Amino acid sequence: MEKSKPNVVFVLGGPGSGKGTQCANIVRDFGWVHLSAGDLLRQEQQSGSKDGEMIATMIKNGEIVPSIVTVKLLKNAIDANQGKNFLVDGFPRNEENNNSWEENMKDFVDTKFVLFFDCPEEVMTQRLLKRGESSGRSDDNIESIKKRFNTFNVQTKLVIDHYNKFDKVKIIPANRDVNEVYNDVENLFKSMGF
Ligand SMILES: Nc1ncnc2c1ncn2[C@@H]1O[C@H](COP(=O)(O)OP(=O)(O)O)[C@@H](O)[C@H]1O
Ligand SMILES: Nc1ccn([C@@H]2O[C@H](COP(=O)(O)O)[C@@H](O)[C@H]2O)c(=O)n1
Ligand SMILES: [Mg+2]
């Protein structure tokens, strides 16, 4: 008769590994709320806050924005959606992200696991150049794309390694057709009781 705290699943994977694509399917079939941290950041810069032109520059360069900004945006969205569960997509991307989540949120949510989509960089590059023909995203060009790989490699893989220490990573290989990947995603969420 108390309201349950939201379940949260971090969704990680390289740029273009299919996080946003698979999250939309989970929203559709499970009724979770999909929060793409990168999306929220693109919105925050959209209508031009203080932090707006900082976010533009860092996104173009594949850099991780200060966590005070990102975690605030996530927390606001989450607080606006009482009684829902959340797919937190593309976060945490480094140790600062994770610590700031822990400090702001751990009292408020049950973060269940990291869903990690494993994909070859070569395949990710091709998807992103394809997405780049119509996305109008400032980071879907080869210069940005390789900077995004280095950030993922240097900062993000350590976070995924951290969660795997505690058995909190579910890996779904993503180098297949989108329905073959989703079949596995949908089976995973069902087996996890969602
Ligand atoms: N399994 C897949 N096979 C081929 N294309 C895919 C697959 N998953 C997603 N895509 C395409 O790859 C691009 C990147 O997908 P997206 O979900 O935006 O990635 P992410 O959020 O991980 O950066 C999009 O054009 C998307 O339609
Ligand atoms: N936790 C996060 C998530 C996204 N980002 C920024 O948004 C950019 C785009 O992220 P997405 O590909 O997940 O939309 C990232 O490359 C990075 O510059 C961030 O700075 N912090
Ligand atoms: Mg995305």
3D structure, described in words:
It contains eight helices and five strands. With 194 residues, the chain is an alpha/beta fold. It has one domain: Rossmann fold (3-Layer(aba) Sandwich). The chain has a five-stranded parallel beta sheet with strand order 2-3-1-4-5, with helices on both faces. The chain binds adenosine-5'-diphosphate, cytidine-5'-monophosphate and magnesium ion (MG). Residues 19-20, 36, 38, 90 line the site of magnesium ion. Keywords: ATP-binding, Cytoplasm, Kinase, Nucleotide-binding, Nucleus, Pyrimidine biosynthesis, Transferase. It is found in: Cytoplasm; Nucleus.
The named CATH superfamily: P-loop containing nucleotide triphosphate hydrolases
Small molecules in complex? adenosine-5'-diphosphate, cytidine-5'-monophosphate, magnesium ion
Question: Radius of gyration, rounded?
Answer: 16 Å
- Which CATH-level-2 architecture? 3-Layer(aba) Sandwich
PDB class: transferase
Keywords: nucleoside monophosphate kinase, NMP kinase, phosphoryl transfer, transition state analog complex, transferase
Assembly: monomeric
Entry title: PH influences fluoride coordination number of the alfx phosphoryl transfer transition state analog
